[PDB]
Design a protein around this nucleic acid. Sequence first.
RNA 1: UUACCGAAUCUUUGAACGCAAACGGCGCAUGGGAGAAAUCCCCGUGCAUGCCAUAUUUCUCAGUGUCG
RNA 2: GCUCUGUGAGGCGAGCUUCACUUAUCGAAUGAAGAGACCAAUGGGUUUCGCGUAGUCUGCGGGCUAUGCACCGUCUCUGAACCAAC
RNA 3: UCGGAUACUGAGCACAACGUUACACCGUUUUUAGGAAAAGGGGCAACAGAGAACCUGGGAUUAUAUUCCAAAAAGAAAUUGCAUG
RNA 4: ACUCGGGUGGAGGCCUGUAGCGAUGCUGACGUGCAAAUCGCUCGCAUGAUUUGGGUAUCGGAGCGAAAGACUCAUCGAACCACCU
Lengths: 245, 208, 50, 52, 109
Amino acid sequence: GKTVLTCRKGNGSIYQVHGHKRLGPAKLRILDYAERHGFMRGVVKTIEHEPGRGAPLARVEFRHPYKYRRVKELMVAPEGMFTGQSVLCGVKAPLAIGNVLPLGQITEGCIVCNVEAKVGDRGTIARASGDYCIIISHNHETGRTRLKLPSGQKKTVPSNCRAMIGIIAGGGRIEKPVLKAGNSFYRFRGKRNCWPKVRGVARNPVEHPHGGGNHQHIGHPSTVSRHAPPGQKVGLIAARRTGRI
Amino acid sequence: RPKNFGIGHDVPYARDLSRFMRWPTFVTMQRKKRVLQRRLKVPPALHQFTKVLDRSSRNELLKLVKKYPSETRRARRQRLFDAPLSVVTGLQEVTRTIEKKTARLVMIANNVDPIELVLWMPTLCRANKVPYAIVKDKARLGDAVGRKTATCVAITDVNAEDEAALKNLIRSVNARFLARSDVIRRQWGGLQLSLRSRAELRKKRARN
Amino acid sequence: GRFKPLAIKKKYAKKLKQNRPVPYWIRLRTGNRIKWNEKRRHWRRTKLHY
Amino acid sequence: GTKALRHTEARLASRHEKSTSRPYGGVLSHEQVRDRIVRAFLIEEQRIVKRA
Amino acid sequence: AYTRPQFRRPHTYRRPSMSAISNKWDAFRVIRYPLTTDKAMKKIEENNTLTFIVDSNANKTEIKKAMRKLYQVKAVKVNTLIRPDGLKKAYIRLSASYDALETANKMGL
RNA sequence: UUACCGAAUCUUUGAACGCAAACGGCGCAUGGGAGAAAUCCCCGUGCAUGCCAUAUUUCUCAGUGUCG
RNA sequence: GCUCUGUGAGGCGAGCUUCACUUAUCGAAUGAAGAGACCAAUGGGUUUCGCGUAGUCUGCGGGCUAUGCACCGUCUCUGAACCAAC
RNA sequence: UCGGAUACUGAGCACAACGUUACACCGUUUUUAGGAAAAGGGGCAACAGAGAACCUGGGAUUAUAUUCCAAAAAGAAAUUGCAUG
RNA sequence: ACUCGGGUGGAGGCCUGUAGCGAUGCUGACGUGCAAAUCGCUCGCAUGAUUUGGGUAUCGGAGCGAAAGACUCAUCGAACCACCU
Ligand SMILES: [Mg+2]
Ligand SMILES: [Mg+2]
Ligand SMILES: [Mg+2]
Ligand SMILES: [Mg+2]
Ligand SMILES: [Mg+2]
Ligand SMILES: [Mg+2]
Ligand SMILES: [Mg+2]
Ligand SMILES: [Mg+2]
Ligand SMILES: [Mg+2]
Ligand SMILES: [Mg+2]
Ligand SMILES: [Mg+2]
Ligand SMILES: [Mg+2]
Ligand SMILES: [Mg+2]
Ligand SMILES: [Mg+2]
Ligand SMILES: [Mg+2]
Ligand SMILES: [Mg+2]
């Protein structure tokens, strides 16, 4: 045959993220001693658009814990995070929007964003716009809170894990129809060479497992096995069910 | 002009970070190599080098070795125009003195690059019933012999003035090793907890 | 255009002064073989692409 | 108080051509300085009161 | 007494560490031969300016110092060019105190 | 002039190695030169990495490695 | 499956799993930037190396098991900040 | 004094180290890493990006000029280095 | 209740149409040509998913593709070079 496009994206050549104009990683502050035994006040300096990203990123400027210099630092913004706002990261941070305080100290039922799964990893869950995760339980005896991932998905993480308070900003992007082929041209301009998506049945038999034939049709089930070798694992992958739900 | 050093106030004056610094790899590894072999369960054959001659006894013995120096190159040449009693030194010479049992005390060093060089030696003195002692450093057997390191030393013989000074040492020495040879061939060593984990266990049992 | 590394200018300079008719007097030597220069170059024909 | 000198000529300009003779003179608007002079004073005055 | 998160290697002491005419460059290697074209003859009389093919690796300041030594005369300026052919060509203009004409004829030109 | 071979000469490069390089570019250090009201300018030599040896008057060090 | 793969406590069955452990290993974070302790032991043993108790052992020097002394071990709704005043 | 380099960074690249490979002609691009020689090694990569001190007149050519001109520099500048009162 | 005039404003993968980018038709010219794909008129897009220079990245059992097995130096249902041969 010939290499499938799903496999070629793994070369990550043409298919790499753009990101020249990206501001850098949008993370939480390094889990300092100050985070673990107090709090760091950083004022939000400016809320930026990172191209290719939905959520605005904030520019909180924490003062450096150990030296005379000030440490501007960039994290995806919770909604209502205005410039000049004083963020408070740390274990005994007050419970407010934008504050980053230990997950086990956040009240059960309150919704948090930019949650970190592993302790100290600097915020990986609930980072996309509009996204958040409600804390659904604490377990102080074993120090592991549960939380509901932005997908209907429960997950247990240590309470020492940081989280930010509130919904991530920029929510509701997806609600607006794109309408133009050109409009989606630009949302992916800042993302990657993801787009346009040619259908595999429109492709040739060399190009794709679905490709080829006179009427353009898949010839075999589109629901591929989990163990299917790459270049084969196209169509619906390890699908448990198909059909509209 | 006092300074607050609460979090988020005055910047701290530069406190020592040796404990959390990132060291050169050879430093981290000689530290960990030492940690690693306390907390593993060492074999009785190899643990015995961890057990060692009491220093007040050691210091006495190395002063004895120093009393019977090998002749210096300057003098050995000068003697040969025609040897003085001295401690046998060297793994090969000391190994003979054990087997020939001419040795009447032997001083295995505690530390050795491959302990294998000497790891067998305590069993070999125990077999020839030669008194032997392990001692803290090949560097001290070193200077005692004027070498910068000595894997071993053998007091094969001594002048009459130091006969008893050797004998009490031979029985203050095989009192700890050769007499305990039944004990030594038994004690599995190691398995020490970190005192960061001994105390953690001191407190978990404190809470229960 | 203007741009040339001097190394390229030295080479076109090389080929330029190399682009000359054989001396008349060389043909008059005994046992001479040469007549025309067999390595005459013309910019409109062979290209010294440097 | 500051001129839009190109840095090509900024080196040769007089120092006060690129500033006003006020604290933060080449850096902050006068209101921005006064925002601080207040904010320095008033914030310390509350902290001095939080000891009581 | 370390106060950096990472170790850095210490300053250690460091100990400080055939041609009879080594300088092959020379006034006589720099300047080569005066040029005798009629653009150059326009300059000797009209511009007080000697023209020379001069060593292509030589620079201007060296060409001044070479005229000073070879022909004993100051060069108020020396703007060289390297010829399409690859020779370098200096137009050296003499100081008014030095005639470019009295000197060029003294030079056998 | 020819032939041969000892003494040399052997430009820019090139493993190319002071750093680069579609740049006849640019260094630091060392000595020289010219020169000049020093700055500039030319020149020579050293200056890559790795590794082995050595510190021969035994270089300076680093390790909560081992001890003392 | 074996191996990597150690260590304790179990139970079951004729080396298998639970449970803790932690030095392998793995993941993460970090500019390896503050871990634990001092709050004290089914802890340690070279300046702490040592004593005392009962049991056993002895190359007569002490050992070892239990055990308790000591000692290791002990202190408390955007401002500015550095370059120290044993 | 123009452009370029000296002297920017960029998509990028790759020396070093390290790692992998029967093998470096691979990969990361910092290195389990002691990279300061008087916190994150070195370099390169734009003649359209950033940077960038000069202008005119000429009766100055066969052919170059924002480059040539001569002491009344046709002239007028700006600019860099050092030094000088 | 927020509608009906009138102006304003200048929106839009809006329209006509240059340049530019194409390339429908004449199945026109040419068709051993100007041309190993061109010429003419006609026509399509021409504020955009536009066109375009430079740089840079991705290629051969591979690359790249708004997908025609298209394109990857006049070479592609597997380039070209050498070799086995
Ligand atoms: Mg098709
Ligand atoms: Mg197929
Ligand atoms: Mg269909
Ligand atoms: Mg179909
Ligand atoms: Mg042609
Ligand atoms: Mg060219
Ligand atoms: Mg020039
Ligand atoms: Mg070089
Ligand atoms: Mg870059
Ligand atoms: Mg550059
Ligand atoms: Mg430019
Ligand atoms: Mg310029
Ligand atoms: Mg012309
Ligand atoms: Mg339109
Ligand atoms: Mg139309
Ligand atoms: Mg087809």
